Amino acid sequence: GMVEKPQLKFKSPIDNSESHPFIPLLKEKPNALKPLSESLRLVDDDENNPSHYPHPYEYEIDHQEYSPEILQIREEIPSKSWDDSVPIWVDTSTELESMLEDLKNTKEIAVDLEHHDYRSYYGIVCLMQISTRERDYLVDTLKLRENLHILNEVFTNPSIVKVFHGAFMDIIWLQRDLGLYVVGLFDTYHASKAIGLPRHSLAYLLENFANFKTSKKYQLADWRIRPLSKPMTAAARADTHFLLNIYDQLRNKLIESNKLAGVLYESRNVAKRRFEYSKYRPLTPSSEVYSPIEKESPWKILMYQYNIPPEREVLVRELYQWRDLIARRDDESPRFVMPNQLLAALVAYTPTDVIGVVSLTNGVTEHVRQNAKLLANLIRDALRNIKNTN
Ligand SMILES: O=c1ccn([C@@H]2O[C@H](COP(=O)(O)O)[C@@H](O)[C@H]2O)c(=O)[nH]1
Ligand SMILES: [Mn+2]
Ligand SMILES: [Zn+2]
Numbered sequence: 501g502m503v504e505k506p507q508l509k510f511k512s513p514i515d516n517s518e519s520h521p522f523i524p525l526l527k528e529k530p531n532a533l534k535p536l537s538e539s540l541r542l543v544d545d546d547e548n549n550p551s552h553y554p555h556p557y558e559y560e561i562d563h564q565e566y567s568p569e570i571l572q573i574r575e576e577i578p579s580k581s582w583d584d585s586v587p588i589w590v591d592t593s594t595e596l597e598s599m600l601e602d603l604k605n606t607k608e609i610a611v612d613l614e615h616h617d618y619r620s621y622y623g624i625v626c627l628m629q630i631s632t633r634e635r636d637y638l639v640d641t642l643k644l645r646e647n648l649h650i651l652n653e654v655f656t657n658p659s660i661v662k663v664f665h666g667a668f669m670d671i672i673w674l675q676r677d678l679g680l681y682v683v684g685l686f687d688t689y690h691a692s693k694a695i696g697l698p699r700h701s702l703a704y705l706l707e708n709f710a711n712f713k714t715s716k717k718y719q720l721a722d723w724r725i726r727p728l729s730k731p732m733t734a735a736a737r738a739d740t741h742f743l744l745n746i747y748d749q750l751r752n753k754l755i756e757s758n759k760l761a762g763v764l765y766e767s768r769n770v771a772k773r774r775f776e777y778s779k780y781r782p783l784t785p786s787s788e789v790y791s792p793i794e795k796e797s798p799w800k801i802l803m804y805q806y807n808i809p810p811e812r813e814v815l816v817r818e819l820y821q822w823r824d825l826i827a828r829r830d831d832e833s834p835r836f837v838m839p840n841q842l843l844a845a846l847v848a849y850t851p852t853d854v855i856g857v858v859s860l861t862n863g864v865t866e867h868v869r870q871n872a873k874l875l876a877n878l879i880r881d882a883l884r885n886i887k888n889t890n
Contacts (some may be wrong), residue, residue, distance in 0.1 A: 504726050505619055506642045507628075509830060516621045518777045521552040524678030526649065531656040534559040549789070553700040555774045557656060557681040563770075563831060564683060569607060573755050576748035577633055579710060579741055587737045591640035599630075601668040603654045606632050608661035610707075610743035613670050614723040614736060615639070622792060622830045625677045626723035631740035637759035638736060641678065642724065644771055648678040650738055655804075660683035665689050665702040668770050668789045672790045676775045683771065690741065691750040694759045702739065709749060710742035755852040795833075797840040806844040813884035815850075819843050822878065826867055837867040852880045 507514055521542070521607040539556040543549070555561075574778040603609060610631040617623035620791050628639040628648070641648060641768055654660055662682050664670055666689035692700040706712040718735045728736070754760040775780075776790050781791030797804050800820065801813045808816065823843065829833045846864040857872040857879075868875060 501725075503619075503722065503724055505831075507620060509642075513829050514621070516831055518779045518828075521550075521780045521812065522776050523553055524556050524677070526556050526652070526675075526677060526681070527679075528649070528652070529556060529656075530653045530681060530697040531560065531564075531658065533563055539701065540583040548784060550780050552774075552776055552780055555681075555772055557683055558772055560658070560683050561658065561768050566684065567607065567659050567661055570661055570686070570751065570764075571760065573752045574748065576745060576752065577744045580609070580634060582741065585635055587636040587638045587733060588637050589640070591643045593644070596639070596644055596647055599639075600650055602635075603630070603632065603651075603660075606641065606660055608633075608652075608663060608676065608744060608747065609654070610640070610663040610740035610747065611667075612664065612669070612736070612743075613673060615669075615673055616722065616724050617795075618722075618833050618836055619771065620833060621828050623833075624724075625671070625673050629735055629736050631744060633713055633744060636741050638728075638733065640726070642682070642726075647658065648680060652676075652679060656681055656683040661747075662684050663688060663740075663743050664701075665705070668773060668787070669790075671771055672772045672775045681771075684720045685767040685771040686747060686751070687763070687767040687770055688750055689747060690770070691754055691763045694763050694766075695750065695753050695757075704820065705746050706738070709746045712738060712742060714763060716745070722779065729766050796835060797843070800838060802844065804840065804844070806841075806848055808844075809884050812847050812882070813887070814849050815879065816843070818878055818882070819846065826871070830867075832867070836865070838865050842868060846875065846879065850879050850883055852876055 516821055524540070526536070529539065534608050536556065540553065542551050564719050565834050588599070590596055612629040613625050614627035615623055616626045616742045625641045630637040630639065639648070655662060663686050665687065667685065667687055671682060674682065688702070689700055690841060692705065699706070703714040706714055715735060718732060720731060751760065754763050769787070773787065776789050776791055778791045782789045785791070800817045801808050802816070820843070823834050827837045832838070842862055842865060845860055846857070849856070849860065851857045851860060853876050854872040856875050858869055
């Protein structure tokens, strides 16, 4: 189908202006050790990062102690029979409240998310998966975007472990879109490594500790679609349904070899990661701060050198910033607006009129089509400031 952009229905309009450092959406702060007060402030300019807001839970992450039974070798609890229950779909404030209530009675929960980045500028969280020892929940993060902040009561309670596999981006996506933070994280990815298993992916873990062959076919899927296809629903459910058992086995092995503290330390840092707009990204890019990364050709003249002539660097760069503003304007992803191959094609063939732009051998996107004149004008200008100068 056409899949009506779900953003259009958000209670708060998206902003790609990037006119200010990223601000946490967190209006409340449970399981607090340091009042939300201090949190919302700033960290005025320095040589390692311009003004920015800090991670609203950085403190508690460092200062709050872990759940006792995490340091003990406990008997592993098998995942529950896939067929004994159906995944609970959550898309109402009521459906959401009963789950929260239910989540508060746990010692630990497994969590995962599905994200979309083709019809959005920064990207958006379309689905969230949460598993307890008894059931699997499927949360529509699109429809409950403005409500999911109440989950903090559980996600920040150090007395409930939260299991994620390689949550380095989940932590980011969670704050950026839902204002959710995580205190008491256990990353099965960092655990796999410490133990030294042949591979460290979730797929690997599922096949060897839960006999479940996974599918990469849904990491290109459009998680915006409603309802979700059975095969899609199953894949999402499979991401947290077996994680708590896998968690038990890894935690125990980590304990048995004196490597837990190391894994917990690694997890605390993944949880501490902060989301900041590219504009205000730290000078020295690291794993403590995450700034939007471009999924395509080098910033200017692409390295993919489709045999990109000398002078055409300016043309190329004008096309880039143009595509970015357009993407930021209609809140789309750069490749949707115009994929590099096309950017290249334009630069490579330098069409000077609308015909030339829309009949461009490779093919054309809607944005390129709906802006063919501006693009022909821009291209024609390049070809001219090239003939002039020298
Ligand atoms: O090769 C990949 C793997 C994952 N993802 C993104 O990560 C989300 C969660 O993937 P995972 O952490 O469950 O593997 C996906 O829904 C998708 O947005 C990708 O874009 N490409
Ligand atoms: Mn994931
Ligand atoms: Zn997943």
